[PDB]
Design a protein around this nucleic acid. Structure first.
Length: 196
RNA sequence: UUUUCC
């Protein structure tokens, strides 16, 4: 069951320790009401600092599945990218999708879709949390990801998002498209317009 | 200025 008891966590804060990450996830699991017993659901964390990802190992298949609901949670300003291991395949009797919804957690999986938005020209000093806040001002988000350099972790100055209410899409465009900030000017438009 | 092991 081990492949079904581990998760990839990407975009982790620079310099974070394995025990700091374990404490964070154990606390979040209990605060969200996802822990299915006394004691810690997360048994171990293994971090690769050079490449900036971690793998979490859980005591339970079901608690592993519930933890998928934390995808996008902000940790020291960064959107944690929670994913299955690539060699995971659902088991018999187990369900692969989370039973729960953690309030305020915004998924990082933003599928191409009608009202998926592109936001370009962002100031380079804004982190995942601040950019998400910029967009949440117009309405609650269904999904969001700020694109970062895979080696340095620095922002690439563009993001994608999807609002819960499809009608907020045009309000966010009207509020943000063409806004000038120094050298740069925001481009905010449905991502299909400028995609390849 | 179209999301990264054992």
């Amino acid at each position: 069951t081990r492949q079904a008891r581990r998760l990839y966590v990407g975009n982790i804060p620079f310099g974070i320790t394995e025990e700091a990450m374990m404490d964070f996830f154990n606390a979040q699991m209990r605060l969200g009401g996802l822990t299915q017993a006394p004691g810690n659901p997360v048994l171990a964390v293994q971090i690769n600092q050079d490449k900036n990802f971690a793998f979490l190992e859980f005591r339970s298949v079901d608690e592993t599945t519930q933890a998928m609901a934390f995808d996008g949670i902000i940790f020291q300003g960064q959107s944690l990218k929670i994913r299955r291991p690539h060699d995971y395949q659902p088991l018999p009797g187990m369900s692969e999708n989370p039973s729960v919804y953690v309030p305020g957690v915004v998924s990082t999986v933003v599928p191409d879709s009608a009202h998926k938005l592109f936001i370009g020209g962002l100031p380079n000093y804004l982190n995942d949390d601040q950019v998400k806040e910029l967009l949440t001002s117009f309405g609650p988000l269904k999904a969001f990801n700020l694109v970062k350099d895979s080696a340095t972790g620095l922002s690439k100055d563009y993001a994608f998002c999807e609002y819960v209410d499809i009608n907020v899409t045009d309000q966010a465009i009207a509020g943000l498209n063409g806004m000038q900030l120094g050298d740069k000017k925001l481009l905010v438009q449905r991502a299909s317009v400028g995609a390849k």
